[model samples]
Target: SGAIYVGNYRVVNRHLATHNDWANLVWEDSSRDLLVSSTTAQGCDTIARCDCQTGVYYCSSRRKHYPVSFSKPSLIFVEASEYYPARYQSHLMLAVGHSEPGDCGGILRCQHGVVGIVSTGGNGLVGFADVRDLLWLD
Candidate 1:
């Protein structure tokens, strides 16, 4: 079915996008602002998670109830600069932490881990800006 084709997009493009396990769709992070992008192709992608505080935007991760769509197409996030490849492309990001089961769908605390999904809206493309103050939410 077309689902495989779609899933491949998110799984294959893990570097720049993600797939919502619960929603069963591919998405990406915003180049700016606090939001996730969805892959709609013809119409457009979906933008989610617009809530932020004090000029800081938080990625809607599994820790925040975000769901994992495919078993393979997991979420990705920015890690250490050294870990980032100068020309690296087509790969998923990772961190380390304990996992929960709701809003933040899972728990990512006291350590780094694959916290949440990377997405945007009506674009299917995810860009990078800057990842600062990596905090462990309690």
Candidate 2:
């Protein structure tokens, strides 16, 4: 719902409202950090890895960007067997349930907002955690 159309290009990264001045070109840079650009102690080596599933972009940072250290998403156990499959999940847990039945096999795939910690039971976790695509306009 926070998606935007930047000129002819579609900006499906961060929400403009949540994130002020969400411009793709302005933000796209190796000199700066992108969602998947990697950097080494020596210099820029690679970017953060991309998640084909979650659509969340990530990259490394020599220094913190806007005070938040850029680390890939992670998955922690909610229940004992609720452990997230690392083989299926990306470093950022982009591939949350992309695995066989041995996986957590969760219902209701969260596809909105930003990835964050989710509480369980009672009211349970109901909100956006991963970035994903809606109907692509052709």
Candidate 3:
């Protein structure tokens, strides 16, 4: 089960720079390199994945793990461009893979308009990154 999905993402209006110049959102690749600017947001980053045996969602970042609750467990990935309205002032950017019966990974769900990632035994690692620079491998 070794696979990789690379993506490029960006934010809107340099929000991370205007919010008292603090670290709001982030994406870290497997190299442990942060693609987003700003310093640590103090446990704001997360890595979401699923328990293959139970189909449950869980995430970890900043050295902590916990269960995530989602009412609808839809496995889909909406690609950027020619889809989803362009967010000129958006705060996040990422990729959406093909979601077929056999296709591997895709986004799990969202609440309050914020989305997170989950795996179905395909792309091994789960993390975030900017549109300009990102590398995801299993």
Candidate 4:
């Protein structure tokens, strides 16, 4: 009888990036910070637990209160090797190789502690990435 699921999400390259979910990332991890040129994309798609009791929606992905946004689009840190074929930059590349049906909206978290969005090629052939960089609230 409280908060409803957030239907809104951020996007990049026509791909859904992050969204407010009933679920989250906490235990206070700074995993995303360790990401650098050496980081590679890993892990399956996942959702973050969102708490909106504060009127402003809060998702715990890093143990902090990073609020949700409907304004959309944010850049996530991702670099993949394995050659799925795409370009965000020739240097810091990424991929989303053949995932579940209509899963373009899901966010892929890496073991190296970073993320990328699944935007294309998963119509049954391969995969991709999309998503705007998060704006550190003014």
Candidate 5:
């Protein structure tokens, strides 16, 4: 949601919503930070250890910007957890039951390795956006 489709084969990472003359990107709602680390000393290399069923999922959302509690290590039985999303849906998002309702833009971790990001949750089921997809547009 932080990109723009230019003429044809062009995609810009960020856009100017209003008064672009000298405006900073809103880190709260923008997906741009998914590609960045909240900590500088740390990097994406940490997420390499995530195989399956060994990570944490959480939501950093609420009435205020206070990042809240996360779930215990979730179970990723198979890669085909269903969540009928936009496009040729198949191995789309991660499905787990650890995270409860009322969570968005949450963090999914492979121990110290940051792997997925919580997209949404409900009905004892949670959907996570595989961070790897942020690399290849499959």
Candidate 6:
């Protein structure tokens, strides 16, 4: 319901009302922080780790280590566990639940947006995996 602060900016959750089909929410450097939604055939699943000045480190299920200009970067999601504060409040929590129950979830926090992970067994603690798919803004 609320957002977390990363560096000098506040990252909040955003929902796309008219465009809920493709990728719903995206992480960006602005007043509007994190957002949520479902997958669309338009292939809207995209995310980038933004520097808020130079550019971003981007990735997807199909690609990795891609770079894009800060001019127009995007965001997306994954599922999370309600046990951990970081996972439960994660932007991709809902999506991760839908995708794979056994798959480890990402730990998105206010401090950095992308922290680490809680194991698939519902560990409730962070740090055990690397966050690859989600957009991590810092």
Clashes per candidate, residues 3 or more apart or on different chains: 35, 12, 5, 13, 0, 13
Q: What is the full ranking by TM-score, best candidate first? A: 5, 4, 6, 3, 1, 2
lDDT value for candidate 5? 0.37
Residue 70, model 4: lDDT of 24
Residue 44, candidate 6: Cα error in Å is: 30
RMSD of each: 14.6, 16.1, 14.1, 16.7, 10.9, 15.4
- Worst-scoring 10-residue span by lDDT in model 5: 5-14
* Cα lDDT for residue 130, candidate 1: 19
**Model 4 over residues 27-90: C-alpha lDDT tens digits?**
1112221111111224232333221111122122222222112212223333443322233331
lDDT of 4 at 108: 38
Off by over 4 Å in 3: 1-28, 31-105, 120-138
Task: Give, for candidate 2, the lowest lDDT window spanning 10 residues.
Answer: 59-68
> Which portions of model 2 miss their true places by more than 4 Å?
1-7, 12-57, 60-131
TM-scores vs. true structure, each candidate:
0.18, 0.18, 0.19, 0.26, 0.39, 0.21
Candidate 1 Cα outliers beyond 4 Å, as residue runs: 1-45, 53-83, 86-138
Considering summed lDDT, which 10 consecutive residues are worst modelled in model 1?
A: 1-10
Q: After superposition, how far is residue 129 of candidate 5 from its true place, in Å?
A: 0.7
Measured by lDDT, the strongest candidate is 5
Ranking by lDDT: 5, 6, 3, 4, 1, 2
Best by TM-score: 5
lDDT of each residue in 1-138, candidate 2, tens digit only: 222231233322221122333422333221111121111223211122233233322211111111122234444333222322222222223232122221111222223323321111212112222322222211
Error of 1 at 46 (Å): 2.7
> lDDT by residue for model 6 over 1-138, one digit each (tens)?
222333333333332123432233443311222333333323312223433322222122223332221221222222433432222332221111211233232232222234322232223211112222344432
Position 75, candidate 1: lDDT: 35
Whole-model lDDT, model 1? 0.25
lDDT of 1 by residue, 60-84 (tens): 4322322221212223443334223
Model 6 alpha-carbon drift over 4 Å, by segment:
16-136
